[PDB]
Nucleic acid binder design. Structure first.
Ligand SMILES: O=c1ccn([C@@H]2O[C@H](COP(=O)(O)OP(=O)(O)O)[C@@H](O)[C@H]2O)c(=O)[nH]1
Length: 351
DNA sequence: AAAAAAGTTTTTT
DNA sequence: AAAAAACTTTTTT
């Protein structure tokens, strides 16, 4: 049983980029469940083999991490092209890891055939014909199916909480008490404005000391529907493997998601925050049944409630510590079911 | 020192 | 087979 895992649209080298990091983390957690897996990318490296030096059909399972396939500038992007050529050459079922609602599987050929550089490829080389099974991080498969309505060979859909790999890694550990320098923190990208209203609601004009780290920049928040006066402090992006340490610098860390994530997706940040030294504060709309933690104190409905909750946490170190203890225990409750999680993954990739 | 000019890297869906 | 920003390094006030 030989497994190959690839990222469909980003080069994989180290933990300096999120797409690379997630692909390596996946390679690691799969390896840790006793499976023989190789990451195949553009070049050989510490964690990878090169597309041009391996035969994709020597593998029994091909796993693909979702990605955008947009050709910015209308120029060729080898990460996308080489990955899809690799997929197209494969003659068995492809397992597409759908961790981001914005990144459903899509074919590059239709968007390559009319380019001035189309001559560099052929339909046979890029058009992926093998059956594809979508492994949805979201429990609502109708939403996952809707996102893949325009791709005929996607014949199977199955839910699997892919994002739990963060807590099941062999080197995992909870963050320790950390000196606080912020009231609230949130790390992420702008996501092309898909979550602008929520970001403005909970991170802007709060009167609190808030930091927004990651790709996002203040000048990206210009939608007239969600005005603001005082923005949080924006700092640069950091490596994925340093995120929990960053979250720990704050009293609390925010959990919000895209509309389609509500009561559907449990995201990496849920685990990165829950395991950190920052109290996890979740937008009620994101988890209305409180399935993450059955304690109302971890949920906020709007800006005012967030401000009040944070004020309460700043005022009572006892409450802060009590809540951290609670979220840490809940996290460990899920870590306890690691074997179950591993078995469900194997079943998802037909093993 | 501080501002402008050059050069380089990253982001954009 | 781009353009706009963001981020650095060098040259001028
Ligand atoms: O500087 C940063 C900011 C974010 N992240 C990662 O990016 C994820 C969030 O991605 P996104 O902005 O798409 O938000 P999501 O949809 O996952 O909530 C976080 O959980 C981290 O794993 C990171 O590695 N470095």
């Amino acid at each position: 049983m030989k497994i190959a895992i690839i990222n469909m649209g980003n080069n994989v080298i180290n933990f300096k980029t999120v797409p690379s990091s997630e692909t390596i983390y996946l390679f690691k957690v799969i390896s840790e469940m006793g499976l023989n897996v190789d990451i195949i990318s553009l070049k050989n490296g510490v964690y990878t083999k090169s597309f041009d030096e391996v035969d994709v059909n020597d593998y029994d399972r091909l796993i693909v991490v979702n990605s955008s396939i947009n050709f910015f500038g209308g120029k060729p992007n080898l990460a996308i092209l080489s990955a899809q050529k690799f997929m197209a050459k494969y003659k068995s079922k492809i397992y597409y890891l759908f961790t981001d609602i914005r990144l459903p599987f899509s074919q590059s050929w239709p968007n390559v055939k009319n380019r001035p550089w189309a001559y560099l490829y052929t339909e046979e080389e890029l058009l992926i014909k093998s059956p594809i099974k979508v492994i949805s991080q979201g429990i609502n498969l109708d939403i996952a199916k809707a996102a893949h309505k325009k791709v005929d060979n996607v014949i199977e859909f199955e839910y699997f909480p892919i994002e739990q790999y963060k807590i099941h890694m062999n080197d995992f550990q909870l963050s320790k008490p950390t000196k606080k320098t912020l009231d609230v923190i949130y790390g992420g990208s702008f996501r092309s404005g898909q979550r602008e209203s929520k970001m403005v609601e909970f991170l802007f004009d709060t009167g609190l000391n808030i930091e927004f780290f990651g790709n996002a920049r203040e000048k990206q928040f210009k939608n007239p529907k969600y005005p603001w006066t005082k923005a949080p402090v924006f700092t640069g992006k950091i490596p994925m493997n340093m995120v929990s340490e960053k979250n720990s610098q704050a009293i609390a860390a925010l959990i919000i998601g895209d509309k389609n994530y509500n009561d559907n997706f449990i995201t990496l940040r849920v685990w990165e925050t829950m395991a950190s030294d920052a109290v996890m504060l979740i937008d009620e709309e994101f988890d209305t049944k409180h399935r993450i933690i059955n304690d109302a104190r971890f949920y906020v409905n709007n800006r005012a409630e967030l401000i009040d909750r944070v004020n309460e946490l700043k005022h009572s170190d006892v409450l802060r510590k009590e809540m951290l203890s609670i979220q840490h225990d809940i996290l460990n409750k899920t870590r306890a079911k690691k074997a179950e999680w591993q078995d469900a993954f194997k079943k998802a990739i037909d093993l």
